[PDB]
Amino acid sequence: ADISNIFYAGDATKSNYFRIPSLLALDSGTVIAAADARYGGTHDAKSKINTAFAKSTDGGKTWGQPTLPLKFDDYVAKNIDWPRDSVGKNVQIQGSASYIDPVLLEDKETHRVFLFADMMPAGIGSSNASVGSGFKEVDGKKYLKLHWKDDAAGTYDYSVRENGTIYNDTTNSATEYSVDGEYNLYKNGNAMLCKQYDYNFEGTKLLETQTDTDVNMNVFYKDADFKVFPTTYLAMKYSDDEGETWSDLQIVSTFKPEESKFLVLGPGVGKQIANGEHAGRLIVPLYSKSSAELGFMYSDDHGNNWTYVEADQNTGGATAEAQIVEMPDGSLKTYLRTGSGYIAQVMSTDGGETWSERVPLTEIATTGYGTQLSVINYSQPVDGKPAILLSAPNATNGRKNGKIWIGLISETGNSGKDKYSVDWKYCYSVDTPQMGYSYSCLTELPDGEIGLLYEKYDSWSRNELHLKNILKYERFNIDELKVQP
């Protein structure tokens, strides 16, 4: 029979809505997953969103209680039905910080799991982020900048330095203030507190009000004593015990270009290179409104340092979400969304440092604004060939008609970026052409089965906002997918 949720309204997240699936089988056989826990309807930031996470230790069949490894506490986490009328549907939480659009990655060499998300200061999301990195240089060293509450609004005369100590940069001296690994604020070693906000509707009016509950004050919150520059940040935590415990929060977007408005994640999974001289490199897809649209961050030292790469010179700031697969020789093929009405592919022969021009992919119909996709390597040959799988909608209007494709890789006899071709030989229909189908993430489960976590609705449509239980999990055998329609 069926019968298919990981995250759902009423689970331990206390969220009624979810979006932006991520699904990843670990080298051990454990399977994990993540998604946005979108409390305030299915809206993008600005809102209140935490990153949810869950684990399966029976091969991706039974899923435990979800956890929230990236969370903010300025607004309460609760189950609330967001109005779906013509006016209220548009209403968003105004004053909350958020984590949005997750990426999971495993370093198989060290058995470390990384979870990434975009990290949005209170009231911010991509569309209203300010231009700039949010970091300053003090004596040539990058530090997160901070604005003190009694300084002028545009003045950021403070910085977070070693051990979370907050410095006054006009005198170069340590203050009595610091932040811990959540970026919560301390004064002379004592937790700073503020009241939590609640949210409730009265008709179509959204009331954001302080409660009596004290939470930690945090530099990402709307009226904290010190506050960050209001732009998009990239956050990461790692786990050496498959998500039992997590590290302190790393803000890894030190490299955010000063000309950029936002620089954010391509949701899904990252990749570790298996073959060739960059074997072991970890790479994570990004996009921006900047000098470049498509970009990546990579680490040659198992996660300690990250280098930013621009993949193009597009200043359009389209939603160029990408996912990455590896060819047998270790070169990379990236498949990305664009704002141009096709999925595009770009190639790299130097482990992701440089990339070819976009090739429009014509097997798949998509919309003008586009939809995220998922692409993965498969570990067993298919029809005697190395294979990749792609999941995406397939429709010119609307997010619908989801397919899983299988691509078979051949050496063309040519050189470099032209060395392989892919034959999209198979195409499996997940439901039917009229049924909603948006974001998705594939994984290869330990039994060679394919797992899929996906949005079973049109998450772009202003008429399908704020639907519950649309995030759906299914498993397939490879034979089932080998369809030729």
Ligand SMILES: CC(=O)N[C@H]1[NH2+]C[C@H](C(=O)O)[C@H](O)[C@@H]1O
């Ligand atoms: C960070 C952010 O706002 N990301 C959003 N970008 C638009 C996407 C889409 O469905 O096209 C998602 O809404 C995504 O969360």
